[PDB]
Coordinates of C-alpha atoms and ligand atoms in Angstrom, one line a residue:
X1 CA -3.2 22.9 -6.1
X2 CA -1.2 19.4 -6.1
X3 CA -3.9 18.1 -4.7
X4 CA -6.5 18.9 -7.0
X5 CA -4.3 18.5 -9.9
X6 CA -3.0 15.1 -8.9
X7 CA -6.1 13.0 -6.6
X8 CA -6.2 9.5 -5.3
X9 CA -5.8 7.1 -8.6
X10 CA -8.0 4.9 -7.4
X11 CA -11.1 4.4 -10.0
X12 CA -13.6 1.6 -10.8
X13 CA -13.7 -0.9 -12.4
X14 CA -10.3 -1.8 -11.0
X15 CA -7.9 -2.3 -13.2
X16 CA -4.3 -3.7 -12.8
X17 CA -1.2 -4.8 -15.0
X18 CA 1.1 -7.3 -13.4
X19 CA 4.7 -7.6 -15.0
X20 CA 6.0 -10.6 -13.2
X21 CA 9.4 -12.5 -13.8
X22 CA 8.5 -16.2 -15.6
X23 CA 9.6 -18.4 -12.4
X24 CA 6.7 -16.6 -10.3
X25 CA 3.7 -17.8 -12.7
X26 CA 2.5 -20.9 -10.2
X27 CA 3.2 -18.9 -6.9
X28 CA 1.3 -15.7 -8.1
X29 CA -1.7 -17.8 -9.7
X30 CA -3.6 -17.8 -6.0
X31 CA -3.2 -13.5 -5.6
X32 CA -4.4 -13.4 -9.2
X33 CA -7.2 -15.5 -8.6
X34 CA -8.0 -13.2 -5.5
X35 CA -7.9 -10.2 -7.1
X36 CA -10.2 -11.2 -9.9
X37 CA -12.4 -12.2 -7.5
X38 CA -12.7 -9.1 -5.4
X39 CA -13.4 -7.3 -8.9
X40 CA -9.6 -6.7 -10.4
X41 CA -9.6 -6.8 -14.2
X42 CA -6.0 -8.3 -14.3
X43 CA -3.9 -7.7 -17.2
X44 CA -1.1 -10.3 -16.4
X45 CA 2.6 -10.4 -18.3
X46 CA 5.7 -12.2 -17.4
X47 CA 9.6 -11.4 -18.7
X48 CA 9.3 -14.7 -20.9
X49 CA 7.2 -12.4 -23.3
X50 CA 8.5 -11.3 -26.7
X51 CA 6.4 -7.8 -25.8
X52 CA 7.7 -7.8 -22.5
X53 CA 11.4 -8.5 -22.8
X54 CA 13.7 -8.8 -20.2
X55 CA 15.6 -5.3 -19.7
X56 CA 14.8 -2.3 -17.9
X57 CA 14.2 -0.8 -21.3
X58 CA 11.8 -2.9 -22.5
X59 CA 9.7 -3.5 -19.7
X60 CA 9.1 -0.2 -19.2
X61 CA 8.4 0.3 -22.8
X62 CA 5.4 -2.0 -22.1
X63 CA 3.8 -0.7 -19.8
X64 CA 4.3 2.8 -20.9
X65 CA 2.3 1.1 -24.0
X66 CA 0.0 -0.6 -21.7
X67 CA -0.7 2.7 -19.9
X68 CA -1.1 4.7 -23.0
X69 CA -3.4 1.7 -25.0
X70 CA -5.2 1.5 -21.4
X71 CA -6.5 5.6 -21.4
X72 CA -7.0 6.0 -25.1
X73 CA -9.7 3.2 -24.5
X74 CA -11.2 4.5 -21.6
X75 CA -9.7 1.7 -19.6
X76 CA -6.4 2.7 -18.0
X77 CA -4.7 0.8 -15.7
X78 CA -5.3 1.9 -11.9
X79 CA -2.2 -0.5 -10.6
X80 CA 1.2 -1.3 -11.7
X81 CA 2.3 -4.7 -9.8
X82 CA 5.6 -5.6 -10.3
X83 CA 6.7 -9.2 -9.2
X84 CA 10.0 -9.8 -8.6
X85 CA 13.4 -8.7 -7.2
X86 CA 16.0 -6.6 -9.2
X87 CA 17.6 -10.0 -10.9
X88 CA 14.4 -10.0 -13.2
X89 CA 13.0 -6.6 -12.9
X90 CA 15.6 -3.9 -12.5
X91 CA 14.1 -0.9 -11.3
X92 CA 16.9 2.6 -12.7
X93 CA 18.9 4.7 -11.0
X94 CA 16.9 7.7 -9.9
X95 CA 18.0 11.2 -11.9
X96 CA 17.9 13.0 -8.3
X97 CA 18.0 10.1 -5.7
X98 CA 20.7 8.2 -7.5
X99 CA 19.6 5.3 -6.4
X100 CA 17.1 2.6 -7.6
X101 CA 13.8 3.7 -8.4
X102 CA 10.5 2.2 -9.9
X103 CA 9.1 5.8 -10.8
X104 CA 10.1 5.1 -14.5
X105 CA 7.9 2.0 -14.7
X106 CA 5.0 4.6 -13.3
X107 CA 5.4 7.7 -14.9
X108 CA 4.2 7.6 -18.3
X109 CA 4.1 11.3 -19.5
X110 CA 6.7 13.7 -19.4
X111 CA 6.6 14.9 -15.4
X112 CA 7.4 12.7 -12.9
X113 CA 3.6 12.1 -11.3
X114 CA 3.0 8.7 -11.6
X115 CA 0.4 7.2 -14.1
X116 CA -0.1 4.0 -11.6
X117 CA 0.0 3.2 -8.2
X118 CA 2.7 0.8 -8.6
X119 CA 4.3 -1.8 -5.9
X120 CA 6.6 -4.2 -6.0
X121 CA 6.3 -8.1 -5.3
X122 CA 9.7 -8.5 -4.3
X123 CA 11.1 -12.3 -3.8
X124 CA 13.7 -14.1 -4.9
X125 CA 12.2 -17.6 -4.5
X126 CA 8.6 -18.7 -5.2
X127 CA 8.3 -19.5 -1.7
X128 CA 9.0 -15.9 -0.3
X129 CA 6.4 -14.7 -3.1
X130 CA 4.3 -17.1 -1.2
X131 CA 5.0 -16.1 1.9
X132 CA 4.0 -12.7 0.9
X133 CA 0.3 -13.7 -0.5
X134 CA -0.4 -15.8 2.3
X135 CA -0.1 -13.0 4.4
X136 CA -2.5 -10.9 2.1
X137 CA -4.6 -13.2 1.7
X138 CA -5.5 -13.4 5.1
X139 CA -5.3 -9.9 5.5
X140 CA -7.7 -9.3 2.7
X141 CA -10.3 -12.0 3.4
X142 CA -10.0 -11.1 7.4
X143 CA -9.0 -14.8 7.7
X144 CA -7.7 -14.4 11.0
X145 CA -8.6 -16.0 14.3
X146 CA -7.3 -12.9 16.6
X147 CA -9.4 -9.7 15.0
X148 CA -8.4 -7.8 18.1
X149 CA -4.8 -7.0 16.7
X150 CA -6.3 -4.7 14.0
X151 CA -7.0 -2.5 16.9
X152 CA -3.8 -1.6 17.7
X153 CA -1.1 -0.1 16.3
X154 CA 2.7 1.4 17.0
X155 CA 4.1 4.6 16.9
X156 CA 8.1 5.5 17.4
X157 CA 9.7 8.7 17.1
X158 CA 13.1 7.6 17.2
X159 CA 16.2 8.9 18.4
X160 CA 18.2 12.2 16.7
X161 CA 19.5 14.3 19.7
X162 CA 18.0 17.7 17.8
X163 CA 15.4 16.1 15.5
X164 CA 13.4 14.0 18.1
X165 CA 11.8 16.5 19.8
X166 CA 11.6 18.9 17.0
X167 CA 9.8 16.9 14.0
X168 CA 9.4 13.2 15.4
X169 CA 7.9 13.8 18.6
X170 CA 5.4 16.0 16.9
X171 CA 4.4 13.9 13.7
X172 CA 3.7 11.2 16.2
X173 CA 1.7 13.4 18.6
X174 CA -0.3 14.7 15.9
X175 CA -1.1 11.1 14.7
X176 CA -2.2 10.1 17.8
X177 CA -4.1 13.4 18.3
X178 CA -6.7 13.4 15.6
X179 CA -6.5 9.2 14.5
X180 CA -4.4 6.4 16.0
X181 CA -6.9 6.9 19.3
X182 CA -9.6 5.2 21.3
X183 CA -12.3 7.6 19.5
X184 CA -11.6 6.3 15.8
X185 CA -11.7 2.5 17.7
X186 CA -7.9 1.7 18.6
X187 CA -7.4 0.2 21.9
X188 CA -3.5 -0.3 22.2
X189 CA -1.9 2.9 20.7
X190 CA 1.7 1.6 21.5
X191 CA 3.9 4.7 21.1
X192 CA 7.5 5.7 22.1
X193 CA 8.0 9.5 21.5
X194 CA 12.0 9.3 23.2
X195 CA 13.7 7.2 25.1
X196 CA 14.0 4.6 26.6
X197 CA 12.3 3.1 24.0
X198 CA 13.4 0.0 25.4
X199 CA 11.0 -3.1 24.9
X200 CA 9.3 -1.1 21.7
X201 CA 9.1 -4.1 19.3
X202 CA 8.0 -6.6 21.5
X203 CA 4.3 -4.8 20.1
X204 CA 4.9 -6.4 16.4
X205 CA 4.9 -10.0 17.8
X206 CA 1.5 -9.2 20.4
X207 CA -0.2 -7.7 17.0
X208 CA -0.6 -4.7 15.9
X209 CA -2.2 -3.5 12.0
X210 CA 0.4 -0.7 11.6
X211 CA 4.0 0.0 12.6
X212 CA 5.5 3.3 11.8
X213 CA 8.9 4.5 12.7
X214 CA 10.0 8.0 12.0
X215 CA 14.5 8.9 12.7
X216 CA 16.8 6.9 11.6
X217 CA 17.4 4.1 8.6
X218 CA 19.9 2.0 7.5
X219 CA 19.7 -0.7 4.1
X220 CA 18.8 -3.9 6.9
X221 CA 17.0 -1.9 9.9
X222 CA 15.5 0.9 11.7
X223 CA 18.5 2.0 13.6
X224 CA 17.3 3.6 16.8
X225 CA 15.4 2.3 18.5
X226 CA 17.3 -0.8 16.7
X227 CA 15.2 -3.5 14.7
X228 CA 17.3 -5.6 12.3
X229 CA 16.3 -7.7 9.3
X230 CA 17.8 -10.3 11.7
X231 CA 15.4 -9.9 14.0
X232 CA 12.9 -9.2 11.1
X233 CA 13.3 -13.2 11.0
X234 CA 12.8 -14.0 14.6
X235 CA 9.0 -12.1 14.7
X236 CA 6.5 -14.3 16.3
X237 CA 3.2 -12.3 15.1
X238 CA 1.5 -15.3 13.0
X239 CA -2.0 -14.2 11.8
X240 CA -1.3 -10.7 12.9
X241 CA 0.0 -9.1 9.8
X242 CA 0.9 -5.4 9.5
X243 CA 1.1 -2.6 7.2
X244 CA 4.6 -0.9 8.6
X245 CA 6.3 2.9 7.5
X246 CA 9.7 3.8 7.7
X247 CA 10.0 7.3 7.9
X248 CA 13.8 7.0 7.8
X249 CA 16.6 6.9 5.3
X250 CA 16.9 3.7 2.5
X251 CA 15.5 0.6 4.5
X252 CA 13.6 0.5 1.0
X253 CA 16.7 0.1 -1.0
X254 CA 15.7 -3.0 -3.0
X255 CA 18.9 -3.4 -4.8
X256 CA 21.2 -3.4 -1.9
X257 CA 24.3 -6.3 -2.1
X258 CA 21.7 -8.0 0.7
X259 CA 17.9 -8.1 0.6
X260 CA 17.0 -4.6 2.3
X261 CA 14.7 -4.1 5.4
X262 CA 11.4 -3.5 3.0
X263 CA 12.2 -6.7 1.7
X264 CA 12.8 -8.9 4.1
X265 CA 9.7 -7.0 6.7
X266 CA 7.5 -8.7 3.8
X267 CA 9.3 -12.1 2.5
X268 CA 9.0 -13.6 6.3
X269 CA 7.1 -16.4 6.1
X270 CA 4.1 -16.1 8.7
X271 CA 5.1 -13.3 10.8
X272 CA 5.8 -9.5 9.8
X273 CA 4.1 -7.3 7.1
X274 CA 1.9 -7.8 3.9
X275 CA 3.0 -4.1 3.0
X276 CA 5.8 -2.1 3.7
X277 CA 6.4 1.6 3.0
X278 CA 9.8 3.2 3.0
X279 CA 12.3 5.5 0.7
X280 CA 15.1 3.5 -1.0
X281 CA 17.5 6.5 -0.9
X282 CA 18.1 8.7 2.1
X283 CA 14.9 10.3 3.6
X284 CA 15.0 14.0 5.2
X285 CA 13.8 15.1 7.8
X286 CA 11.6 18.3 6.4
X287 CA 9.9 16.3 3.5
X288 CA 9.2 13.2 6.4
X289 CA 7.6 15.9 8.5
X290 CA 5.0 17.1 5.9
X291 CA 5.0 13.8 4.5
X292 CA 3.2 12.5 7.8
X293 CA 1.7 15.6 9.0
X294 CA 0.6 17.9 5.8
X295 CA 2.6 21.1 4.5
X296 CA 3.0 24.1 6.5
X297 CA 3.9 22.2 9.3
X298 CA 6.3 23.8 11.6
X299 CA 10.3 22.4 13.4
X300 CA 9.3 22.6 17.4
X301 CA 5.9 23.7 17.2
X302 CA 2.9 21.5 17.3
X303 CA 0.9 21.1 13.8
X304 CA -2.7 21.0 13.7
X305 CA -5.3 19.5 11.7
X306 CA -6.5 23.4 10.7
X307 CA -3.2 25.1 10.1
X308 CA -1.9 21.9 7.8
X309 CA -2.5 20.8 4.2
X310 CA -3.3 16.6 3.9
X311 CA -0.5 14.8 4.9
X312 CA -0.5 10.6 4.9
X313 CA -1.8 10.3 8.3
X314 CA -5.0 12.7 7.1
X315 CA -5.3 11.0 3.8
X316 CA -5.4 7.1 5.4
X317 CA -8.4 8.5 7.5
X318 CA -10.6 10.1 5.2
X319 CA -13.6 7.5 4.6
X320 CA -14.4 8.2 0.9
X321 CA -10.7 8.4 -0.5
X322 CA -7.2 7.3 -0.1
X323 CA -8.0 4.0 1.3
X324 CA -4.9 2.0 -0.4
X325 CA -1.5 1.5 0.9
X326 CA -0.6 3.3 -2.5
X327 CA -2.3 6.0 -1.9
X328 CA -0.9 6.7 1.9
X329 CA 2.5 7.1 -0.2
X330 CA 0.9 9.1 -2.8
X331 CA -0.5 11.4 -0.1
X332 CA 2.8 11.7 1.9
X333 CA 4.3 12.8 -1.2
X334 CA 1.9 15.1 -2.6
X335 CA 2.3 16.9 1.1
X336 CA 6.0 16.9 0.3
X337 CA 5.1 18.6 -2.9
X338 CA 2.6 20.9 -1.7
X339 CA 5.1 21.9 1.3
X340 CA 7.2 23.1 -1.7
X341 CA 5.0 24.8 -3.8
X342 CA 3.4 26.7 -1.2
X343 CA 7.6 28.2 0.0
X344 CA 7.8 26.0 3.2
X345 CA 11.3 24.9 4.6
X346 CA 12.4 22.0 1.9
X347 CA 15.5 19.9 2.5
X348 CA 15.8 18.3 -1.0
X349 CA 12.9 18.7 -3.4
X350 CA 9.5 16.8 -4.5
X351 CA 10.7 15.1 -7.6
X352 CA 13.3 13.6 -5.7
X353 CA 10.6 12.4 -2.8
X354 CA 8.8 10.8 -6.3
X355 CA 12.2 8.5 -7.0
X356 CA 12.3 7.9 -3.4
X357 CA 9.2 6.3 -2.1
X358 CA 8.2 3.0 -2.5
X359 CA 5.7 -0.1 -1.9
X360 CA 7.4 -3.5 -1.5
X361 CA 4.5 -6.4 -0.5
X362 CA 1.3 -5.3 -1.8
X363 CA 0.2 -1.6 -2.2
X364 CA -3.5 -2.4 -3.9
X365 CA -4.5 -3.3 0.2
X366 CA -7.4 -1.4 1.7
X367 CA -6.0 -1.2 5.3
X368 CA -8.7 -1.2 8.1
X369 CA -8.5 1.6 10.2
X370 CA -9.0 -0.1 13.7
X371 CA -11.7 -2.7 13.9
X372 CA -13.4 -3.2 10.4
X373 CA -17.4 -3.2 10.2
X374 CA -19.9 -5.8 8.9
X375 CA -21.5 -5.0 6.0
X376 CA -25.1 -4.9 4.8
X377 CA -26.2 -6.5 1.5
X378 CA -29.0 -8.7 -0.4
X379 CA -28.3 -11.3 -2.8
X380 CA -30.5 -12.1 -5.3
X381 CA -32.0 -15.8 -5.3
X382 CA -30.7 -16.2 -9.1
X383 CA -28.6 -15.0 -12.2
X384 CA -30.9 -14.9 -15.1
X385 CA -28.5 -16.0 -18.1
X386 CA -27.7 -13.8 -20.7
X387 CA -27.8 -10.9 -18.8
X388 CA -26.1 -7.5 -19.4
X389 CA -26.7 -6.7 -15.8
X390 CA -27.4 -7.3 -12.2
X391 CA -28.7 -5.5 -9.8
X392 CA -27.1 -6.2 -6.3
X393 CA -28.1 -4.5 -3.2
X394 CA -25.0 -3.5 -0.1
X395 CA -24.2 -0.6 1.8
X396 CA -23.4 3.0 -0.6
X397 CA -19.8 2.9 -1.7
X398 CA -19.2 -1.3 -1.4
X399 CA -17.8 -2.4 -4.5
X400 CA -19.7 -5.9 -5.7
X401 CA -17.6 -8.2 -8.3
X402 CA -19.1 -11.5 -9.7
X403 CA -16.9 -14.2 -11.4
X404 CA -15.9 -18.0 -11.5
X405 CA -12.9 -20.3 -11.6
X406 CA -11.1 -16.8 -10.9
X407 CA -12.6 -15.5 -13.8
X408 CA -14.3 -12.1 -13.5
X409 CA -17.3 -11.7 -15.1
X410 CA -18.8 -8.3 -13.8
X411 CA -18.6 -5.5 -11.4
X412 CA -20.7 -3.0 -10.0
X413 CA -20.3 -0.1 -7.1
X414 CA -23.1 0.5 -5.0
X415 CA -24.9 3.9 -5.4
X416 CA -25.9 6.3 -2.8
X417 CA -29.3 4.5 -1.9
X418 CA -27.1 1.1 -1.8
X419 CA -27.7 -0.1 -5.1
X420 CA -24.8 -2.1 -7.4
X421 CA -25.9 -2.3 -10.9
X422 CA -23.1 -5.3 -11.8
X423 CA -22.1 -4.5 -15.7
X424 CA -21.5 -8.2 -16.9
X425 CA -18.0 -7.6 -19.5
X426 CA -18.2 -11.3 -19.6
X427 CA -22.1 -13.0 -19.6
X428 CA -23.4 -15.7 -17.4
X429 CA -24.2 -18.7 -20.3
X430 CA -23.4 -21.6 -18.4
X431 CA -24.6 -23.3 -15.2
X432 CA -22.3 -23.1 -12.2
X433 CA -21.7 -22.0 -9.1
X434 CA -20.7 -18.1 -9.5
X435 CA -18.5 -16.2 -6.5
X436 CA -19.8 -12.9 -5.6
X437 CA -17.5 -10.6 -3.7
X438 CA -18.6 -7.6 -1.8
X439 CA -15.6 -5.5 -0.3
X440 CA -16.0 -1.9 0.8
X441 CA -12.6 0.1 2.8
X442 CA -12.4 -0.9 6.9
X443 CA -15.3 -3.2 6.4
X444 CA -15.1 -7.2 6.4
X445 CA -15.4 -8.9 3.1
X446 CA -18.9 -10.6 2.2
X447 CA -17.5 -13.8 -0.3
X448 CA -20.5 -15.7 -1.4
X449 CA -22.1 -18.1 -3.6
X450 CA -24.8 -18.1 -6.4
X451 CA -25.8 -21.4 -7.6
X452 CA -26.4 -20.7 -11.6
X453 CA -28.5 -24.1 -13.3
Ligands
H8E1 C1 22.8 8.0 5.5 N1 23.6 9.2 6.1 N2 22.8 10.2 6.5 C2 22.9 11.4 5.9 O1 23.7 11.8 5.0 C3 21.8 12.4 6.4 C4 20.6 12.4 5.4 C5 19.3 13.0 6.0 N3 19.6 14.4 6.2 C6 18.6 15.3 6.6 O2 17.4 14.8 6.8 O3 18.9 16.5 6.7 C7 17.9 17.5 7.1 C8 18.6 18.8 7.3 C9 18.5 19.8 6.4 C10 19.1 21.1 6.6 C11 19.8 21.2 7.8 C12 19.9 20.2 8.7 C13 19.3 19.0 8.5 C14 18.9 12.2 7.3 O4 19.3 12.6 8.4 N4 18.2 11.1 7.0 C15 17.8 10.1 8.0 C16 16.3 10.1 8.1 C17 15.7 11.5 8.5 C18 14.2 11.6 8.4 C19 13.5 10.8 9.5 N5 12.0 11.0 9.3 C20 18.4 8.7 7.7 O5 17.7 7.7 8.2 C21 19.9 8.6 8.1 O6 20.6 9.6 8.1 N6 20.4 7.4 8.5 C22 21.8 7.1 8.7 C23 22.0 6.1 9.7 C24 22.3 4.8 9.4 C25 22.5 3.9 10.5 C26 22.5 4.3 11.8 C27 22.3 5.7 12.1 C28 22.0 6.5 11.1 C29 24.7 8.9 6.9 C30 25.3 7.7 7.0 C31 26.5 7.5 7.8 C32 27.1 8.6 8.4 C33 26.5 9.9 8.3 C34 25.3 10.0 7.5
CA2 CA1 2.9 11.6 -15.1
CA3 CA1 16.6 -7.0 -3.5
NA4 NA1 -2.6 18.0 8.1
NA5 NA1 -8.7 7.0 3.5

């Protein structure tokens, strides 16, 4: 099925191609460096490039280049980060949405699957790209001083006098019924299922990890219950950064004649999101409901975990798989897709739903899923030059990346019986002090030192 035909794209060793306008090279240089250091081999080009060019045309005939160069040598990117608004990356006009679209820059082949898990980096100063990795940062290296906001989250089915209580109160119900719950570790499961939804927002500046809103959109807000980009300005949630959803018509239109809602939840400096989910054209309510819930979910009737396919909700909470922001989209639209194939209800079709979704802020996150555990490990007391290999010991599944001066030199995943055999591409031949960087999904990072000479 889609499923099975079209899985999580996330693979090891990470890879990622950034395409980033010229005037973000200084700004981005301290997410590069992170990435490399948490085990991202980071192919990095900006629009200054002869290769690259500066046209919707040409960039994408990069990275479809990229892509294709990539797989042919057993190395294809996992991630497609795009930095930069529409004045330097343009996105196209989507065949079925009509309306911008980075699905082009992602789908290499001839259907319209995506090749990459692709987000977009959108700022229109250096500062707001700042803003954004400063935000990740944090997130990423759980940086902040109030870890009891990752244990809460917010949940609004919004108003629609028919469609409230027949799709939103439902996809929010069966959120909170199998995840978003004091059994999986969430404390504070904020949620408004109708009204009055009065006094909903004032959750994003307490702290909460997630936000999702499911009725209606507009380009600069979620309409009702109303949150405006204006307000968007005024949040007060420092150190408390979020991943929001809108499940809601084009608050994810990122070449609107103003900076759209996606935008500006993840440009604010210091308060707001570090990832923001949302469809840039209008959303429907059908494809939102299996989106969120899985397909053969039913208008009016409550959906269960047994008589559903995966939907995004299902996806985020497996441990062993679909542990990016990416790949919550990607599963939210494979349930559209599914919903399709399998002759549910559909209100306007999966290739569509492909144009439609996007990341803006960044999409190669692991989001904890409530309060994130410590992890186990054993460094070794050296690094032996001119080695092909380490061995480095953490819990089965942690990922364990070894580098310097945001150089990466080698990676490893740990096997079942917690054991990361670290293939050095690039080998230790100098003394130094070498980073080692253990990350695993919805546990803390381990960021270490081994002293080399
Ligand atoms: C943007 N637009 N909306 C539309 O055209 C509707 C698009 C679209 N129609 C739809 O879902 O139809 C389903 C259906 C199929 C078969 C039968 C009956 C229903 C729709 O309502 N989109 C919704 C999101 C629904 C999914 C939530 N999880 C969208 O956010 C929307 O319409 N926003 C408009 C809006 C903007 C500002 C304030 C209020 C409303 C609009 C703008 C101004 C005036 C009227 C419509
Ligand atoms: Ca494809
Ligand atoms: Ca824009
Ligand atoms: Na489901
Ligand atoms: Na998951």
């Amino acid at each position: 099925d889609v499923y099975t035909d079209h899985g999580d794209l996330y693979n090891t060793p990470v890879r990622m191609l950034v395409v980033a306008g010229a005037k973000f090279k200084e700004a981005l240089k301290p997410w590069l460096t992170w990435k490399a250091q948490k085990g991202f081999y980071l192919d990095v080009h900006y629009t200054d490039e002869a290769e690259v060019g500066t046209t919707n045309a040409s960039i994408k005939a990069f990275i479809h280049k990229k892509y294709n160069d990539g797989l042919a040598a057993s190395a294809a990117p996992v991630f497609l980060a795009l930095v930069g608004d529409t004045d330097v990356i343009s996105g196209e006009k989507g065949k079925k949405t009509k309306k911008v679209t980075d699905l082009y820059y992602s789908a290499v082949d001839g259907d319209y699957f995506p090749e990459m898990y692709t987000f977009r980096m959108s700022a229109s100063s250096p500062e707001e790209l700042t803003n954004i990795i400063d935000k990740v940062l944090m997130y990423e290296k759980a940086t902040m001083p109030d870890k009891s906001y990752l244990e809460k989250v917010l949940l609004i089915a919004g108003a629609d006098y028919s469609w409230n209580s027949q799709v939103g109160q439902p996809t929010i119900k069966y959120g909170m019924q199998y995840y978003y719950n004091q059994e999986h570790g969430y404390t504070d499961v904020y949620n408004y299922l109708k009204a009055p939804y009065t006094g909903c927002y004032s959750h994003l500046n307490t702290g909460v990890s997630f936000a999702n809103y499911t009725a209606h959109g507009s380009e600069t807000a979620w309409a009702d219950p109303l949150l405006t980009t204006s307000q968007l300005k005024a949040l007060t949630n420092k150190d408390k950064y979020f991943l929001a959803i809108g499940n809601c018509c084009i608050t994810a239109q990122f070449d609107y004649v103003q900076p759209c809602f996606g935008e500006v939840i993840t440009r604010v400096k210091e308060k707001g999101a570090y990832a923001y989910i949302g469809s840039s054209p209008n959303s429907y309510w059908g494809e939102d409901y299996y989106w969120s819930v899985g397909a053969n979910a039913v208008f009016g009737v409550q959906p269960t975990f047994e008589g559903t396919s995966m939907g995004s909700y299902d996806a985020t909470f497996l441990e062993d798989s679909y542990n990016t922001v990416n790949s919550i989209m990607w599963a939210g639209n494979l349930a559209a897709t599914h919903a399709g194939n399998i002759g549910n209800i559909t209100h306007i079709g999966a290739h569509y739903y492909w144009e439609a979704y996007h990341v803006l802020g960044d999409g190669s996150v692991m989001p904890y899923r409530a309060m994130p555990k410590t992890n186990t490990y054993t460094l070794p007391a050296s690094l032996p030059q001119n080695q092909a290999s380490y061995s480095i010991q953490a819990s089965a599944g942690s990922y364990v990346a070894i580098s310097k001066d945001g150089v990466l030199y080698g990676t490893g995943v740990a096997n079942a019986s917690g054991v990361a055999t670290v293939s050095m591409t690039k080998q230790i031949t100098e003394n130094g002090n070498y980073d080692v960087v253990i990350t695993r999904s919805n546990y803390l990072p381990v960021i270490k030192q081994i002293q080399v000479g």
